[PDB]
Design an enzyme around this catalytic site. Structure first.
Site, PDB file in Angstrom:
ATOM      1  N   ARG A  16       5.533  13.133  30.111  1.00 42.94           N
ATOM      2  CA  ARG A  16       5.593  13.888  31.350  1.00 42.94           C
ATOM      3  C   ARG A  16       4.442  13.498  32.254  1.00 42.94           C
ATOM      4  NH1 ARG A  16       7.560  18.990  27.951  1.00 42.94           N
ATOM      5  NH2 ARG A  16       9.722  19.116  28.734  1.00 42.94           N
ATOM      6  N   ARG A 157      11.100   5.232  36.113  1.00 44.35           N
ATOM      7  CA  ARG A 157      11.037   6.689  35.985  1.00 44.35           C
ATOM      8  C   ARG A 157      12.315   7.218  35.335  1.00 44.35           C
ATOM      9  NH1 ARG A 157      10.331  12.176  35.945  1.00 44.35           N
ATOM     10  NH2 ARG A 157      11.296  13.299  37.680  1.00 44.35           N
ATOM     11  N   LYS A 168      12.346  14.259  21.924  1.00 37.39           N
ATOM     12  CA  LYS A 168      12.941  15.567  21.675  1.00 37.39           C
ATOM     13  C   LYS A 168      13.742  15.529  20.380  1.00 37.39           C
ATOM     14  CE  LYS A 168      13.302  16.775  26.594  1.00 37.39           C
ATOM     15  NZ  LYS A 168      14.144  16.928  27.820  1.00 37.39           N
ATOM     16  N   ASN A 194      14.786  21.826  30.829  1.00 38.44           N
ATOM     17  CA  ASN A 194      13.656  22.760  30.916  1.00 38.44           C
ATOM     18  C   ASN A 194      13.376  22.991  32.417  1.00 38.44           C
ATOM     19  OD1 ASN A 194      10.927  23.638  31.450  1.00 38.44           O
ATOM     20  ND2 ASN A 194      10.451  23.236  29.277  1.00 38.44           N
ATOM     21  N   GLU A 198      10.712  21.219  35.605  1.00 43.82           N
ATOM     22  CA  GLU A 198      11.271  20.673  36.815  1.00 43.82           C
ATOM     23  C   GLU A 198      11.032  21.566  38.003  1.00 43.82           C
ATOM     24  OE1 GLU A 198      15.738  20.275  36.751  1.00 43.82           O
ATOM     25  OE2 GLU A 198      15.411  19.928  34.591  1.00 43.82           O
ATOM     26  N   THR A 238      18.121  11.341  35.496  1.00 45.32           N
ATOM     27  CA  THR A 238      17.236  11.179  34.354  1.00 45.32           C
ATOM     28  C   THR A 238      17.897  11.903  33.171  1.00 45.32           C
ATOM     29  OG1 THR A 238      15.329  11.208  35.822  1.00 45.32           O
ATOM     30  CG2 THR A 238      14.948  11.459  33.454  1.00 45.32           C
ATOM     31  N   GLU A 242      19.339  10.843  29.419  1.00 46.12           N
ATOM     32  CA  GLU A 242      18.978  11.623  28.252  1.00 46.12           C
ATOM     33  C   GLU A 242      20.146  11.921  27.313  1.00 46.12           C
ATOM     34  OE1 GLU A 242      15.564  14.423  28.644  1.00 46.12           O
ATOM     35  OE2 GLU A 242      16.138  14.382  30.781  1.00 46.12           O
TER      36      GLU A 242
END
Ligand SMILES: O=C(O)[C@@H]1C[C@]2(C(=O)O)C=C[C@@H](O)[C@@H](C2)O1
Ligand SMILES: O=C(O)[C@@H]1C[C@]2(C(=O)O)C=C[C@@H](O)[C@@H](C2)O1
Ligand SMILES: N[C@@H](Cc1ccc(O)cc1)C(=O)O
Ligand SMILES: N[C@@H](Cc1ccc(O)cc1)C(=O)O
EC number: 5.4.99.5
Lengths: 252, 252
Positions: A16, A157, A168, A194, A198, A238, A242
């Site tokens: 992060r 990014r 995770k 989450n 964000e 993003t 994931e």
């Protein structure tokens, strides 16, 4: 975050933190691109008047492929956090190779949203960061080299989802495996999302666009637009990465 | 500027004056819209949760269409300065018609940038004027009735280009005749552009925002964002309208 210390890479906080650094980079680049008109002709594939023989695609496409062989040469894409726009088209360099120890699962390179990213950048992002509207006939090159950096940052990014995802997955293997077997899209999504994190992101971006965006003695970037962009594009995609990464996480 | 005295409508100064009165009007409408949030959902086409039977389109589209037939009934579009958003979805009224003499060329009604205007308003303007970011589930109708209000003004203003165009044409037929036949865009573009005039306009907007935008006893609108809008959208699109009007000006 060191790429030969798998541990310091599969650490969510770090990940992060790195993402936070990128915020500025991305901003700086948008700021740069703002100087030139939209330049429609640059993104239009096989434009008459901008034709490159034995080549099919847009001025930008050309510009991007050329550049990619250049970076290709200095070993850019040999790195896990770097994913090329024209992947099946780069050659192995004339230089010893850094033997990065496996962090991500093998199929990791296959996940490649650059096609989407390039598209959305050209259609959604450009109109929000460019000043005037039209063709700046002798800045096509200029415009192009800029779009490229934005694009590369954007891609680094965004494609970071893979690490986050992996990180995770580590944290709770049983739970994730279950969801994965289940091919439970919404279940995984809500688990990885989450909103609090964000939430902070969108806030700080507003502040940065306000300080960096103006001559400290103007307005090359619109705070609300940057939020729109990160909110509607950067953060969404993003997450796509994931999940896609997560589903194929149990392959052979 | 009396619509039954053609000559008074085709006087460039008069046309400019009317365009000034509109500045306030638009400010007011903007000021109004600024009270509610962005309300994304009002703009999403066929939104699951707002689905209207036998209708494809957004909530806004519906609010807009309905409203247009209302105004249609009261002869709104029978006038040269009012151009509808859904032009072919309109029915003639139950009311003896006003008989407007010709001012503009016949194809006039065909010049219609409302698709762009509506789309740009939705993506570029709304983020700039609405206060916070999100959906106000029980204010969609409000947001919608006000959006439409902004929309009709912008539309009226922008489409005024046709009158301007017709004016400049009359002032020097031979010159424009040449440019038109040549289908010389840049030639017409820089020949109808008067930057002194457009410069003066941005000036007074800045001020108007500073006074109307604040409670004289806060900040519904920034003079900066107001200036941004006219510079990037209002004036530009008004000029597009002027070119096309001119290009088609020689039709049989
Ligand atoms: O956990 C995370 O940090 C990552 C990155 C993300 C982002 O886009 O920044 C932030 C929040 C999460 O919902 C997603 C998206 O996963
Ligand atoms: O001459 C004009 O009056 C019209 C209107 C316009 C505007 O958008 O305000 C103002 C100045 C001109 O450059 C253009 C655009 O034509
Ligand atoms: N970090 C790696 C890969 C890389 C190369 C070039 C770049 O532009 C970016 C990344 C290196 O520098 O060797
Ligand atoms: N000016 C004309 C046409 C018009 C109708 C309705 C409006 O909302 C605006 C203009 C009239 O009122 O007779």
């Amino acid at each position: 975050m060191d790429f030969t210390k798998p541990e310091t890479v599969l650490n969510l906080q770090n990940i992060r933190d790195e993402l936070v650094r990128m915020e500025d980079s991305i901003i700086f680049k948008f700021i740069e691109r703002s100087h030139f008109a939209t330049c429609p002709s640059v993104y239009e594939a096989n434009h008459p008047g901008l034709e490159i023989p034995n080549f099919k695609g847009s001025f930008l496409d050309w510009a991007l492929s050329n550049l990619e062989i250049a970076h290709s040469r200095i070993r850019r894409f040999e790195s896990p956090d770097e994913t090329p726009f024209f992947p099946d088209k780069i050659q192995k360099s004339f230089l010893p190779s850094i033997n990065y120890p496996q962090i991500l699962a093998p199929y990791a390179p296959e996940v490649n949203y650059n096609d989407k990213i390039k598209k959305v950048y050209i259609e959604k992002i450009i109109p929000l960061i460019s000043k005037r509207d039209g063709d700046d006939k002798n800045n096509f090159g200029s415009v192009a080299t800029r779009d490229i950096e934005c694009l590369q940052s954007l891609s680094r990014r965004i494609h970071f989802g893979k690490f986050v995802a992996e990180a995770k997955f580590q944290s709770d293997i049983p739970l994730y495996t279950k969801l994965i077997k289940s091919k439970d899209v919404e279940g995984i999504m809500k688990n990885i999302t989450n909103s609090a994190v964000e939430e902070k992101i969108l806030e700080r971006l507003t502040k940065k666009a306000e300080v960096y965006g103006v001559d400290p003695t103007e307005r090359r970037i619109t705070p609300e637009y940057l939020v729109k962009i990160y909110k509607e594009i950067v953060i969404p995609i993003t997450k796509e990465v994931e999940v896609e990464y997560l589903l194929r996480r149990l392959e052979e």
